[PDB]
Scaffold this active site. Structure first.
Site, mmCIF file in Angstrom:
data_model
loop_
_atom_site.group_PDB
_atom_site.id
_atom_site.type_symbol
_atom_site.label_atom_id
_atom_site.label_comp_id
_atom_site.label_asym_id
_atom_site.label_seq_id
_atom_site.Cartn_x
_atom_site.Cartn_y
_atom_site.Cartn_z
ATOM 1 N N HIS A 79 91.215 70.521 -27.286
ATOM 2 C CA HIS A 79 90.149 69.906 -28.126
ATOM 3 C C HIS A 79 90.731 69.520 -29.492
ATOM 4 C CE1 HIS A 79 87.676 72.245 -25.112
ATOM 5 N NE2 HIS A 79 86.912 71.164 -25.149
ATOM 6 N N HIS A 83 92.726 64.237 -27.793
ATOM 7 C CA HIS A 83 91.516 64.116 -26.994
ATOM 8 C C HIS A 83 90.518 63.190 -27.672
ATOM 9 C CE1 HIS A 83 87.842 65.436 -24.747
ATOM 10 N NE2 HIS A 83 87.302 65.830 -25.894
ATOM 11 N N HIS A 117 83.889 63.200 -32.207
ATOM 12 C CA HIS A 117 82.927 64.003 -31.379
ATOM 13 C C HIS A 117 83.352 65.467 -31.178
ATOM 14 C CE1 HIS A 117 85.696 63.809 -27.968
ATOM 15 N NE2 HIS A 117 84.959 64.756 -27.435
ATOM 16 N N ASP A 118 84.618 65.747 -31.373
ATOM 17 C CA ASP A 118 85.038 67.146 -31.336
ATOM 18 C C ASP A 118 85.532 67.710 -32.698
ATOM 19 O OD1 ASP A 118 84.185 68.307 -29.019
ATOM 20 O OD2 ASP A 118 85.920 67.744 -27.818
ATOM 21 N N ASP A 216 84.160 61.564 -22.316
ATOM 22 C CA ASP A 216 84.555 62.882 -22.680
ATOM 23 C C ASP A 216 85.364 63.531 -21.558
ATOM 24 O OD1 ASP A 216 84.747 65.041 -24.417
ATOM 25 O OD2 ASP A 216 82.931 66.014 -23.631
ATOM 26 N N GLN A 268 89.076 73.222 -9.579
ATOM 27 C CA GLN A 268 89.115 71.790 -9.896
ATOM 28 C C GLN A 268 88.286 70.972 -8.895
ATOM 29 O OE1 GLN A 268 90.698 70.111 -12.481
ATOM 30 N NE2 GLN A 268 91.189 72.067 -13.512
HETATM 31 C C1 LIG Z 1 89.349 66.706 -18.324
HETATM 32 N N1 LIG Z 1 88.595 67.877 -17.917
HETATM 33 C C2 LIG Z 1 87.622 68.452 -18.683
HETATM 34 C C3 LIG Z 1 87.174 69.499 -17.936
HETATM 35 C C4 LIG Z 1 86.124 70.389 -18.310
HETATM 36 C C5 LIG Z 1 85.115 69.909 -19.212
HETATM 37 C C6 LIG Z 1 84.031 70.577 -19.591
HETATM 38 C C7 LIG Z 1 83.906 71.939 -19.033
HETATM 39 O O1 LIG Z 1 82.933 72.572 -19.365
HETATM 40 N N2 LIG Z 1 84.919 72.395 -18.177
HETATM 41 C C8 LIG Z 1 84.811 73.696 -17.595
HETATM 42 C C9 LIG Z 1 85.986 71.621 -17.813
HETATM 43 C C10 LIG Z 1 87.935 69.452 -16.730
HETATM 44 C C11 LIG Z 1 87.821 70.384 -15.594
HETATM 45 O O2 LIG Z 1 88.517 71.572 -16.005
HETATM 46 C C12 LIG Z 1 88.248 72.662 -15.157
HETATM 47 C C13 LIG Z 1 88.627 73.922 -15.596
HETATM 48 C C14 LIG Z 1 88.369 75.023 -14.791
HETATM 49 C C15 LIG Z 1 87.756 74.940 -13.544
HETATM 50 C C16 LIG Z 1 87.498 76.166 -12.735
HETATM 51 C C17 LIG Z 1 86.267 76.485 -12.209
HETATM 52 C C18 LIG Z 1 86.033 77.644 -11.476
HETATM 53 C C19 LIG Z 1 87.029 78.578 -11.225
HETATM 54 C C20 LIG Z 1 88.267 78.248 -11.742
HETATM 55 C C21 LIG Z 1 88.505 77.091 -12.470
HETATM 56 N N3 LIG Z 1 89.828 77.063 -12.844
HETATM 57 C C22 LIG Z 1 90.397 78.164 -12.402
HETATM 58 N N4 LIG Z 1 89.478 78.910 -11.724
HETATM 59 C C23 LIG Z 1 89.772 80.178 -11.057
HETATM 60 C C24 LIG Z 1 87.403 73.654 -13.129
HETATM 61 C C25 LIG Z 1 87.648 72.526 -13.917
HETATM 62 N N5 LIG Z 1 88.825 68.450 -16.720
HETATM 63 MG MG LIG Z 2 82.641 68.748 -27.387
HETATM 64 ZN ZN LIG Z 3 85.197 66.411 -26.076
#
Ligand SMILES: Cn1cc(-c2ccc(=O)n(C)c2)c(COc2ccc(-c3cccc4c3ncn4C)cc2)n1
Ligand SMILES: [Mg+2]
Ligand SMILES: [Zn+2]
Length: 312
Positions: A79, A83, A117-118, A216, A268
């Site tokens: 952040h 970004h 925004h951040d 975002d 993911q």
């Molecule tokens: C570009 N970008 C922003 C974001 C993003 C934006 C806003 C937000 O609130 N989040 C959480 C993420 C992302 C996705 O990132 C992720 C991070 C972690 C997970 C995850 C979920 C569950 C168990 C997990 C996970 N990882 C390891 N374990 C064991 C999934 C996606 N990509």
């Molecule tokens: Mg934000």
């Molecule tokens: Zn952001």
């Protein structure tokens, strides 16, 4: 509070020109600013210029404003200033590809809102009235606008000025992902029923709201090796937050736990299906020219599947 740039910083920016070999690149949704750190403030100036010409902002106040924004982002793994610029570029591609839907006011508001925004994000979640971080990031934007020779909107009437601040506030508030689930759902219904009407301000707000989520989250729409690297930055921060919880004998949720690394690709995948895919599908339905964001999102989702299935 509210740090400011030096004269060297704003003047150096005034003197920058984007290399010709990037001008076609930067128009593409999947463009990666990553290899060009030196150029990021320059890239923002460029996009402002392409989208409203060399006379939309007093060029000196503009460069001062951008260079002070930069100094109010912190040196956190995700952040950060990188970004802000990434999100602003996504907004730029959207506005460029939808050139006559948005007012001149909206175009200036949303590029600025994206860069700010951040603002002053500390590297820890909302969790560590509501929309806490966001009401604050808007607050910081207001404070920079108010400084000295940093008011880029001074040349607006007080009616237009009040307008653009309210575009910005709603835009930054919209970057709280808890509110995205409901906005999207509302948009999905209006589109279905045929009732969506861009002549209606509150419908415009919603569409813009979705546009802010799509920008975002746009690191999920880059080519596979860039999305992969960004995901490492997101985890550096999440795991650093999880490490601070364990320091107090607290058990962090799986996503913030570096001991749960092998469940990364599964995590993911769920996020892509639950958040990202619906976001860019509803956007594509309202704004067909944003379709390449969806396409790139789908491609990265199928990469994550192949990681899980054990083939990359
Ligand atoms: C570009 N970008 C922003 C974001 C993003 C934006 C806003 C937000 O609130 N989040 C959480 C993420 C992302 C996705 O990132 C992720 C991070 C972690 C997970 C995850 C979920 C569950 C168990 C997990 C996970 N990882 C390891 N374990 C064991 C999934 C996606 N990509
Ligand atoms: Mg934000
Ligand atoms: Zn952001």
């Amino acid at each position: 509070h509210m740090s400011i740039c030096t004269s060297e910083e704003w003047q150096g920016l005034m003197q920058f020109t984007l290399p010709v070999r990037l001008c076609k690149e930067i128009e593409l949704f999947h463009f990666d600013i990553g290899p060009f750190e030196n150029m990021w403030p320059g890239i923002f100036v460029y996009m402002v210029h392409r989208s409203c010409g060399t006379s939309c902002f007093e060029l000196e106040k503009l460069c001062r404003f951008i260079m002070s924004v930069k100094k109010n982002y912190r040196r956190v793994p995700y952040h950060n200033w990188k970004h802000a610029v990434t999100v602003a570029h996504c907004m730029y591609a959207i506005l460029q590809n939808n050139h006559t839907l948005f007012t001149d006011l909206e175009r200036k508001g949303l590029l600025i809102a994206c860069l700010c925004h951040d603002l002053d994000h500390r590297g820890f979640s909302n969790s560590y009235s509501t929309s806490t971080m966001e009401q604050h990031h808007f607050s910081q934007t207001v404070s920079i606008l108010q400084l000295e020779g940093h008011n880029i909107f001074s040349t607006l009437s007080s009616s237009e000025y009040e307008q653009v601040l309210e575009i910005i506030r709603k835009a930054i508030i919209a970057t709280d992902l808890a509110l995205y689930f409901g906005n999207r759902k509302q948009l999905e219904e209006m589109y279905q029923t045929g009732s969506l009407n861009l002549n209606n301000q509150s419908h415009r707000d919603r569409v813009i709201g979705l546009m802010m989520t799509a920008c975002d989250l746009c690191s999920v729409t880059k080519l596979w090796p860039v999305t992969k690297l960004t995901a490492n930055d997101i985890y550096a921060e999440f795991w650093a937050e999880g490490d601070e919880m364990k320091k107090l004998g607290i058990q962090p949720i799986p996503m913030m736990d570096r001991d749960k690394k092998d469940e990364v690709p599964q995590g993911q995948l769920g996020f892509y299906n639950a958040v990202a895919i619906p976001c860019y599908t509803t956007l594509t339905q309202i704004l067909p020219p944003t379709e390449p964001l969806l396409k790139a999102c789908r491609d990265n989702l199928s990469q994550w599947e192949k990681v899980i299935r054990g083939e990359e």
